[PDB]
Amino acid sequence: GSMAKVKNFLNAKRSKGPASILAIGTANPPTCFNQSDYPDFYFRVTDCEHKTELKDKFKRICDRSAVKKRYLHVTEEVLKENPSMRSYNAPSLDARQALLIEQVPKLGKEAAAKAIKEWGQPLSKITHLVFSAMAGVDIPGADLRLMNLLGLEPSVKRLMIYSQGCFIGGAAIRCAKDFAENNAGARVLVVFSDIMNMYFHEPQEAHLDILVGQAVFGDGAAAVIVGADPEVSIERPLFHVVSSTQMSVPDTNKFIRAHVKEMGMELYLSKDVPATVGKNIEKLLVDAVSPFGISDWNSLFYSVHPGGRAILDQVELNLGLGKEKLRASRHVLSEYGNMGGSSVYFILDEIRKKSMQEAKPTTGDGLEWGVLFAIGPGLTVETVILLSVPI
């Protein structure tokens, strides 16, 4: 009897169509670090200029990184105020957390506000908050802080995701899709605020993975508004989120690890990650587009998580893509570095912007179908099949 009531309720709160991305905003910290200067700054600020072999190594990693500049909260001022950061294994977690608990919801606020302005709707129409952050675990978390900073309704359904791993970029979008599609009228604010300060350490010959990290990690935040059934007047879908799948590659559990410790974050980043993704990317895509009769990989627009140059080179190679297919991804890697989970949305934004600039027919470089590859520790890949919007 009441199951009838439930079924009417359930049917009434479904959406008619698919969740789409309605706006994207991005943000960064003020201080720019140019890769050309980065090895000098790094080895000097850490009193490690005698480590000549290690510095040559890091200089080579930067030269080959295809990172031209990054935006960092870890400034010289911050490093002077917190000397514990400059001696490897020194207790520094409390200081790092003190910066994070403040900066993470703020950087996310900046990217969220740009998203909301583009979106055009009143804040009160935001029903769901999903906040994903690389670091800064705190209770209550950045999600609530964001609600206060923006003045979202206290009745927004908030969801905080600390340190899931960079594939969260895709994972969160799928969740948003479901939140939107199962709730008529729902507008989901999804925020990635990734600050990499937990990975900064004094260079050490005994810990080379951090040099890898230190070459590429940059700070960034992106906010995406997700909704189904847009109001034809004000709301303008950028991309439709068609379907999303997740794969955790067997026996790769240790390829990337990051432990939260008293010294900050202890990082392992296997040199074999890009090769593994290379091996798996085609099957992932083939299975992802199987419902849609898609077979020409060069007919898709691409957002690939820029974990590094080798990652992009590897996806390009194993999918047989033309040399321009990953241009937006390389661009974001170039101008921002690897900003973790937020990165693919910088990419998405870029693809959109250039699409307007070149008077393309669609938001997806004139193509209709696209794929976002969110890659993280696992190794786990979320593959998101997207659909562009005509412009």
* 269-328 positions binding its own copies, by CB under 8 A: 291-293
If one asks whether residue 185 binds its own copies (CB under 8 A), the answer comes out as no
Interaction of residue 262 with its own copies, rule CB under 8 A: yes
Q: What positions carry a catalytic annotation? A: 166
> Coil, helix or strand for 172?
helix
**Residue 171 interacting with its own copies (CB under 8 A):** yes
Phi, psi of 226 (to 5 degrees): -120, 135
Task: Assess 155 for contact with its own copies (CB under 8 A).
Answer: yes
- Least Cβ distance, residue 319 to its own copies (angstroms): 20
The vertex-387 CA angle with 190 and 232, nearest 5°, equals 75
- C-alpha separations of 320 from 126, 260, 296, 297 in Å: 41, 38, 10, 7
* 33-41, 47-55, 215-223, 252-260 -> range binding its own copies (CB under 8 A): 252-260
Closer CB to its own copies, residue 62 or residue 159? 159
Q: How far is the CB of 197 from its own copies (least distance, A)?
A: 15
Which is nearer to its own copies, 7 or 117 (by Cβ)? 7
Residue 261 in the binding site for its own copies (CB under 8 A): yes
Per rule CB under 8 A, is residue 253 in the interface with its own copies? yes
In the list 148, 279, 299, 358, the residue contacting its own copies (rule: CB under 8 A) is: 148
Cβ neighbours, 10 Å, residue 24:
24
304, β-bridge pairs: 373
- Which residue in 196, 258, 269, 384 binds its own copies (CB under 8 A)? 258
What does the CA dihedral 264, 169, 29, 202 come to, rounded to 10 degrees?
Answer: 30
Choice from 35, 183, 197, 329 touching its own copies (CB under 8 A): 183
**Binding status of residue 157 toward its own copies by CB under 8 A:** yes
Choose which of 196, 256, 319, 339 interacts with its own copies (CB under 8 A): 256
- Can you say how many angstroms the Cα of residue 81 is from the centroid of all Cα atoms in its chain? 29
Say how far apart CA 147 and CA 70 lie, in whole Å.
28
How would you class 216 by CB atoms within 10 Å of its CB: exposed for 0-12, middle for 13-18, buried for 19 or more?
buried
Strand 380-388 and strand 369-376: pairing? Answer: antiparallel
Residue 220 exposed, middle or buried by CB count within 10 Å (0-12, 13-18, 19+): buried
Q: How many CB atoms lie within 10 A of CB 347?
A: 29
Among 33, 42, 58, 179, binds its own copies (CB under 8 A): 179
Q: Does 259 bind its own copies (CB under 8 A)?
A: yes
- Quick check: 226 binds its own copies (CB under 8 A)? no
Nearer to its own copies, 20 or 334 (CB): 20
Which residues on neighbouring strands pair with residue 209, listed in sequence order?
none
In the bound complex, what is the minimum distance in angstroms from residue 223's beta carbon to its own copies? 19
Q: Which is nearer to its own copies, 259 or 271 (CB)?
A: 259
- Are the CB atoms for 307 and 166 separated by under 8 Å? yes
Alpha-carbon span 332 to 39, nearest angstrom:
21
Residue number, 31 or 182, with CB nearest to its own copies: 182
Q: Is 160 in the site for its own copies (CB under 8 A)?
A: yes
Q: Is 208 exposed, middle or buried, given 0-12, 13-18 or 19+ CB atoms closer than 10 A?
A: middle
Q: Which stretch binds its own copies (CB under 8 A): 91-99, 114-122, 208-216, 304-312?
A: 91-99
Cα separation, 234 vs 257, in Å, equals 44
* Per-residue tokens: 249: 């590659």
Among 260, 275, 310, 321, binds its own copies (CB under 8 A): 260
Q: Which of residues 48-77 bind its own copies (CB under 8 A)?
A: none
Residues 109-138 that bind its own copies (CB under 8 A): 137-138
- Residue indicated by tokens 């794969």: 247
Is 235 an interacting residue with respect to its own copies (CB under 8 A)?
Answer: no
